């Protein structure tokens, strides 16, 4: 067994010359030389079978990523696992090596207006496809946008992804949420479980603002501070937008807040392309009903150099039904991961 930071990292014969490249969610990530494609690849070791929760996320991410085929979504090249359920303790997911991500890039690098435009285009092109598959990403943020040396962008990390369920999206005030606070739409704190496509557009809006300045636009320190950051820039919601929040604890909370006026995008982003700010305004709209749709954002003037709807494909095979993974035991989820990974096996 090849070892890395002496743990097992046992990746076939086909993957040699291993380099540790950090610790992801369900285990260790390395780069490795692929002997059959003569390219270096990324390999993620996953060890989830002890915990029903880890099995859930692992299965959901593998099902989604194996069904999707899109230039702007990370693909699975290979899956290495034992030939039997009994011997399967770990799963290794092989993907294209991406030298960096937008989080790492924004920490040190100024983006040109052309880079911001091209990166935003790729994000929306990939999100069009996800949404067309009736899937919500629910955790879009810079660190989940992988980049290579020629600025190709790939969305990753479908750990929080769900089948869209706009009809069952309503919930109480202060409902607990897992996804990164700074990219959460205002409605997640108010009355939304985040089962509508408009939650992803909000996160993309936050990412565009972060690309314009190299700083998060809404870095809230706690759940309610996230709302104060949002309303500090957008201003107090209008009567119309409030009238759409029927939940009394959420409405009366917003009514308790001192009045705030909007901060103009051009004051926050004096260097920014006016078209980028128009589109940003439309993405960071408080009312999710009035928020711009992914396809409208691709059609916005800011993206007119790239916009080509014939080359912005939609999914052949949407997830029409909810993935009822929450009440399956560990053991069934391990069998389903085994079945889902079976196409990569010799034979």
Curated annotation (Swiss-Prot):
SUPFAM superfamilies registered for this protein in UniProt: Protein kinase-like (PK-like)
Motif (TXY): 175-177
Tissue specificity of this protein: Highest levels within the nervous system, expressed in different tissues, mostly in muscle, thymus and heart.
Domain of life: Eukaryota
Modified residues (Phosphothreonine): 175, 180
GO biological process: androgen receptor signaling pathway; animal organ morphogenesis; apoptotic process; B cell receptor signaling pathway; Bergmann glial cell differentiation; cardiac neural crest cell development involved in heart development; caveolin-mediated endocytosis; cell surface receptor signaling pathway
Record domain Protein kinase: where: 15-303
Substitution effect: residue 109 to A: Reduced affinity for DCC. Strongly reduced affinity for DCC
Modified residues (Phosphoserine): 19, 236, 238, 274
Annotated effect of mutating residue 115 to A: Reduced affinity for DCC. Strongly reduced affinity for DCC
Function summary: Serine/threonine kinase which acts as an essential component of the MAP kinase signal transduction pathway. MAPK1/ERK2 and MAPK3/ERK1 are the 2 MAPKs which play an important role in the MAPK/ERK cascade. They participate also in a signaling cascade initiated by activated KIT and KITLG/SCF. Depending on the cellular context, the MAPK/ERK cascade mediates diverse biological functions such as cell growth, adhesion, survival and differentiation through the regulation of transcription, translation, cytoskeletal rearrangements. Acts as a transcriptional repressor. Binds to a [GC]AAA[GC] consensus sequence. Repress the expression of interferon gamma-induced genes. Seems to bind to the promoter of CCL5, DMP1, IFIH1, IFITM1, IRF7, IRF9, LAMP3, OAS1, OAS2, OAS3 and STAT1. Transcriptional activity is independent of kinase activity.
Full protein name: Mitogen-activated protein kinase 1
Naturally occurring in which organism (per UniProt): Rattus norvegicus
């Amino acid at each position: 067994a090849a070892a890395a930071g002496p743990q097992v990292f046992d990746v076939g014969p086909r993957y040699t010359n291993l380099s540790y490249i950090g610790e992801g969610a369900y285990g260790m990530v390395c780069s490795a030389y692929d002997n059959l494609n003569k390219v270096r690849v990324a390999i993620k070791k996953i060890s989830p079978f002890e915990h029903q929760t880890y099995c859930q996320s692992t299965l959901r991410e593998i099902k989604i990523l194996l069904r999707f085929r899109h230039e702007n979504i990370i693909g699975i090249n290979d899956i290495i696992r034992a030939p039997t359920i009994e011997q399967m303790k770990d799963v290794y997911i092989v993907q294209d090596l991406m030298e960096t991500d937008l989080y790492k890039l924004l920490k040190t690098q100024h983006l040109s207006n052309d880079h911001i435009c091209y990166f935003l285009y790729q994000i929306l092109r990939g999100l069009k496809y996800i949404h067309s598959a009736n899937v919500l990403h629910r955790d879009l943020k810079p660190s989940n946008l992988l980049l290579n040396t020629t600025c190709d962008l790939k969305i990753c990390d479908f750990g929080l992804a769900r089948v869209a369920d706009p009809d069952h999206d309503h919930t109480g005030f202060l409902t607990e949420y897992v996804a990164d606070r700074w990219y959460r739409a205002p409605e997640i704190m108010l009355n939304s479980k985040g089962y509508t496509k408009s939650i992803d557009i909000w996160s993309v809006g936050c990412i565009l603002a972060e690309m314009l300045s190299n700083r998060p636009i809404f870095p809230g320190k706690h759940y309610l501070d996230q709302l104060n950051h949002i309303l500090g820039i957008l201003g107090s919601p209008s009567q119309e937008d409030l009238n759409c929040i029927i939940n009394l604890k959420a409405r009366n909370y917003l009514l308790s807040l001192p009045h705030k006026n909007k901060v103009p995008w051009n004051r926050l982003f004096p260097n920014a392309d006016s078209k980028a700010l128009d589109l940003l305004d439309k993405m960071l709209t408080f009312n999710p009903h009035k928020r711009i749709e992914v396809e409208q954002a691709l059609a916005h003037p800011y993206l007119e150099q790239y916009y080509d709807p014939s080359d912005e494909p939609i999914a052949e095979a949407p997830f029409k039904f909810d993935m009822e993974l929450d009440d399956l035991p560990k053991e069934k989820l391990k069998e389903l991961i085994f079945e889902e990974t079976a196409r990569f096996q010799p034979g």
